[PDB]
Design a protein around this ligand. Structure first.
Ligand SMILES: Nc1ncnc2c1ncn2[C@@H]1O[C@H](COP(=O)(O)OP(=O)(O)OP(=O)(O)O)[C@@H](O)[C@H]1O
Ligand SMILES: [Mg+2]
Lengths: 54, 71, 71, 101, 384, 50
């Protein structure tokens, strides 16, 4: 929904949560896919130190 | 001057392969930045080698040649 | 005539570039150092579809990477 | 432009939104989408100015479904693809980003 | 209508030409006489098999020449001496024998694609009175270009040298471009036509060589009319700055003086120049005695505009609607290309109807569009 | 023969003296030089649709 409302650096977090959920369900295919998305989104410069650490 | 034998499409090379005999001196552990182009080069190069059929079963045409340009 | 041999060689690139297409292989990679040397029958899609730009500006995390991999 | 040598002069409009939807639809029959993805919906997110801009939404969307690794092009790909081209559309409408370095 | 019979008369003679020629070849051609048969025996003795074209560099006067072949070895050739020893000159293409090289013979003509550009491939079927009107400014091109070639009789009577050259200029759409093509259709003299925008190349020094060629062909062909279409396109047109530019423009101008008359003393060439910018031309070219009378064109007046519109409406279908006489009235000292564009556009309005009657209504709608290229390609519109 | 031979027809020659032998089935077309080196497909009106 927040792709209609995209202005958000707060979906960077949502991607990282998404990766953790998939990892513990023990699929690494889509844990990798979301993690890749999260790396791309943090390449743009607004990200906290905490956010980069996660 | 007559066609008396043939030569295979392997022999009469311009120069042999350098991708199964020699190997380049660069990997992406010694590439730093250009992360923006790093997303673009695996679309073009890496995905058709592993399975060219990905594009076809989606129904999008695979890109043709890659131009790299810059200063 | 000698400059027409150069042109004849470019024409064979087009012929073999077209013939190669829709095959498992990676369609030809070529790089340039000046993007003012192109022609409108070389840069045209069906020979060069994808255009990976190379900047010198990038951004602060990606320039950070270049200092760090050579470090 | 001397009159006597030109007897037809044909303009091409930067599209309507009625025209911009049908250009999406011509390209989407090459593609395989998930059923229930309206392309009238995509053309209204766009404002475009060429039939290439909407040709690039279709292209970018099928490269996003390439990354995803599903056969079907998803509805998610067409949200993101609109926004990629729209950003690129508005970034040559300022003074022009370079296409050749 | 009813020219059918004239078409059939013409046709019948074409049928008779086809017939007589075919039958003549077949056992009455030249197959059974000894002044061909015994002459060719000893013609073929010294002829090949290969006939190995050469390029004639220079002659030597002892019955030899130095040729350089296209295949790269030179030969110091002899000359058999039945082909007429001195009738061959540098730039000729020569037939050399398959063995020891003698000039077996000499080819006159070898078609280059570079004289194709000048030479015609189409006939300009519109001739006199399809450019009708300007009947006072056609006595300065058919009393000094067409007419001396047709009648040297009148010019033997006065003596002195016949007229040489003309320059046409005036406002666009006064028929300037077609006038030249219309006098050369009728005389049937050697019509070279060269565009003004091909003299300027993005390559240097080979520009003047092209212009030099054009007049050598003219002098080689005794009755000669050279239309240089557009030589205002030499001072408004330039490419790159290292092979176009000023230097190129100076060189070409000067080449043309030598060609046209200069020192050459060549065959009678009439020159016809279309221009409307008459200071792109040398102060050694717009003096007369090379270009004798000068022709000014003004826009045709109202009764001349009746003549111009009458060429166009013989092709137009007509109606009881049509009123020609009011179409002229609105136009005031306007060009004959506006009138030509109105009727072509009036036929475009007919076509849209999908009807084959062209009426007064179709002409007047097209008249307002034709005057719109003069009031709205002007963005001030009404003079501010 | 010369009435069965014509301009822009590729021939075969036999190098005994370059004796014209047969016509060559394939000959060059200069228009294909232009269009091929350019490379330009045909379209229908469905790729202008809209
Ligand atoms: N007197 C006329 N009668 C018939 N048609 C004319 C006449 N004058 C000009 N036209 C037409 O006007 C058009 C342009 O004139 P033309 O090309 O002969 O030379 P121009 O005066 O150099 O003009 P331009 O090169 O700008 O068209 C042609 O289609 C020609 O047939
Ligand atoms: Mg003209």
């Amino acid at each position: 929904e927040f792709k209609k409302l995209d202005d958000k650096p707060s979906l960077v977090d949502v991607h990282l949560l998404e990766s953790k959920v998939y990892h513990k369900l023990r699929n690494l295919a889509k844990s990798k896919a979301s993690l890749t998305a999260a790396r791309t989104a943090a390449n743009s410069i607004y990200c906290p130190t905490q956010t980069v650490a996660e | 001057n007559a066609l008396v034998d043939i030569l295979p499409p392997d022999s009469d090379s311009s120069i042999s392969v350098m991708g199964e005999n020699e190997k380049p001196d660069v990997t992406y552990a010694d590439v730093g930045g250009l992360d923006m182009q790093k997303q673009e080069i695996r679309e073009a190069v890496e995905l058709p080698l592993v399975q060219a059929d990905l594009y076809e079963q989606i129904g999008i045409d695979p890109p043709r040649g890659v131009l790299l340009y810059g200063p | 005539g000698s400059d027409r041999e150069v042109q004849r060689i470019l024409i064979e690139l087009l012929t073999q570039m077209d013939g190669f297409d829709q095959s498992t292989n990676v369609k030809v990679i070529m790089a340039t150092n000046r993007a003012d040397t192109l022609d409108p029958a070389l840069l045209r899609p069906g020979r060069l579809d994808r255009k990976i730009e190379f900047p010198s500006l990038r951004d602060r995390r990606e320039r950070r990477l270049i200092f760090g991999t050579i470090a | 432009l001397r009159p006597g040598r030109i007897d037809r002069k044909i303009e091409f409009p930067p599209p309507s939104v009625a025209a911009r939807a049908e250009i999406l639809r011509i390209h989407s029959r090459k593609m395989n989408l998930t059923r229930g993805i309206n392309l009238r919906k995509v053309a209204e997110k766009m404002n475009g100015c060429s039939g290439a801009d909407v040709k690039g939404v279709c292209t970018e969307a099928g490269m996003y479904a390439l990354r995803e690794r599903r056969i079907h092009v998803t509805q998610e790909d067409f949200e993101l693809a609109v926004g990629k081209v729209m950003n690129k559309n508005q970034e040559t409408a300022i003074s022009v980003a370079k296409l050749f370095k | 209508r009813c020219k059918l019979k004239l078409l059939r008369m013409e046709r019948i003679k074409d049928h008779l030409l086809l017939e007589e020629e075919f039958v003549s070849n077949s056992e009455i051609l030249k197959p059974f006489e000894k002044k061909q048969e015994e002459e060719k025996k000893q013609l073929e003795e010294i002829r090949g098999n290969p006939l190995s074209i050469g390029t004639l560099e220079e002659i030597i006067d002892d019955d030899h020449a130095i040729v350089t072949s296209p295949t790269m070895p030179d030969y110091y050739v002899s000359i058999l001496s039945f082909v007429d020893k001195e009738l061959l000159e540098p730039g000729c293409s020569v037939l050399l024998h398959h063995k020891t090289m003698s000039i077996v013979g000499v080819l006159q003509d070898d078609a280059d694609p570079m004289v194709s550009v000048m030479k015609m491939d189409k006939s300009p079927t519109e001739s006199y009175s399809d450019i009708g009107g300007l009947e006072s400014q056609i006595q300065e091109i058919k009393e000094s270009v067409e007419l001396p070639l047709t009648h040297p009789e009148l010019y033997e009577e006065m003596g002195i040298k016949p007229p040489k050259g003309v320059i046409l200029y005036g406002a666009p759409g006064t028929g300037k471009t077609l006038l030249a093509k219309a006098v050369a259709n009728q005389t049937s003299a050697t019509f070279l036509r060269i565009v003004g925008s091909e003299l300027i190349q993005k390559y240097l020094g080979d520009g003047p060589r092209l212009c030099r060629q054009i007049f050598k062909v003219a002098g080689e062909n005794a009755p000669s009319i050279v239309f240089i279409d557009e030589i205002d396109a030499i001072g408004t047109k330039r490419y790159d700055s290292n092979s176009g530019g000023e230097r190129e423009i100076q060189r070409t101008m000067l080449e043309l003086l030598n060609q046209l008359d200069g020192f050459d003393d060549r065959g009678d060439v009439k020159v016809i120049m279309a221009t409307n910018k008459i200071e792109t031309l040398d102060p050694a070219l717009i003096r007369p005695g090379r270009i004798d009378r000068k022709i000014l064109f003004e826009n045709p007046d109202l009764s001349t505009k009746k003549k111009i519109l009458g060429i166009h409406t013989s092709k137009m279908n007509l109606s009881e609607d049509v009123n020609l006489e009011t179409l002229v009235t609105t136009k005031d000292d306007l060009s004959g290309a506006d009138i030509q564009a109105m009727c072509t556009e009036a036929g475009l309005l007919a076509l849209r109807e999908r009807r084959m009657q062209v009426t007064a209504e179709d002409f007047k709608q097209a008249k307002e569009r034709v005057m719109k290229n003069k009031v709205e390609e002007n963005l001030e519109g009404l003079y501010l | 023969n010369v009435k069965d031979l014509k301009a822009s027809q590729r021939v075969c020659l036999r190098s005994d003296s370059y004796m014209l032998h047969k016509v060559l089935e394939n000959k060059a077309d200069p228009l294909v030089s232009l269009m091929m080196v350019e490379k330009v497909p045909d379209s229908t009106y469905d790729m202008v649709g809209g």
